[PDB]
Amino acid sequence: NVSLARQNYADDSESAINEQINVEYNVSYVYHALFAYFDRDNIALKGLAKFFKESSEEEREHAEQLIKYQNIRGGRVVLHPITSPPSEFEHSEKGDALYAMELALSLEKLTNEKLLHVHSVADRNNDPQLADFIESEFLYEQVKSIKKIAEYVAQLRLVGKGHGVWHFDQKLLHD
């Protein structure tokens, strides 16, 4: 029936973790839609495809880590529906590549906002282990990832459409 491990773990904290699992899965799914777009033969931006596919795997790993954490604390994992992401990332004015990177950046900042919410739930329930788990396993990697993608945005704006985007994509491919 009941968890024998659960201790100092509030219903609201359990719920916030189940919510964060769903955020990470949904963002993982959008990254996989981004991979599927740039992997098309008529788009053919293989570095962007690779980067978005690796980002999809990374976010799913975050989701799996939170599932494991939930059970460590004795909460119960509830897996919520995963929403259908858009399929098309065409943007004639910005170029598809810059538009996709700007969307990835907004994806990372949304994830960060959600993580900061989990942290506030932990603090208001006096759960220092949950607060530390979020800080040490997610918050620092999240701001590093935000800065990295913001740098890609800046570089894609600098090189311009056409040859420059293709070249930035080759740099992404071989990193």
Region 40-79 residues binding a copy of itself, contact defined as CB under 8 A: 40-44, 46, 53, 60, 64, 67-68, 70-74, 76-79
Q: How far is the CB of 65 from a copy of itself (least distance, A)?
A: 12
Pick from Mg ion, a copy of itself, none: which does 62 bind, CB < 5 to 8 A by kind?
A: Mg ion
The response to whether 24 counts as a known ligand-binding position is: yes
Q: Among 48, 56, 134, 172, which residue interacts with Mg ion (rule: CB under 5 A)?
A: 56
List the interface residues with a copy of itself, window 1-20 (CB under 8 A). Answer: 1-5, 7-8
The distance from CA 4 to its chain's CA centroid, rounded to whole angstroms, is 32
Residue 161 is encoded by which pair of tokens? Answer: 């459409």
Pick from Mg ion, a copy of itself, none: which does 68 bind, CB < 5 to 8 A by kind?
A: a copy of itself
Query: H or E segment at 165?
Result: helix 163-174
Neighbours of 141 (CB within 10 A): 13
126 three-class SS:
coil
Q: How far is the CB of 46 from a copy of itself (least distance, A)?
A: 8
Contacts of 136 (CB under 8 A, 6+ apart): none
Site size for a copy of itself (CB under 8 A): 85
List the interface residues with Mg ion, window 113-152 (CB under 5 A). Answer: 132, 135
How many angstroms separate the CA atoms of 87 and 104, rounded? 14
The response to whether 108 counts as a known ligand-binding position is: yes
Q: Among 65, 116, 125, 172, which residue interacts with a copy of itself (rule: CB under 8 A)?
A: 116
**Per-residue x/- marks for Mg ion, 80-119, CB under 5 A?**
----------------------------------------
Residue listed under structure tokens 């538009």: 99
How many angstroms separate the CA atoms of 32 and 5, rounded? 36
Calculate ∠ Cα 50-56-62, nearest 5°. 140
Distances (CA, A) of 25 to 38, 78, 143: 20, 13, 19
Pick from Mg ion, a copy of itself, none: which does 29 bind, CB < 5 to 8 A by kind?
A: a copy of itself
The response to whether 137 counts as a known ligand-binding position is: no
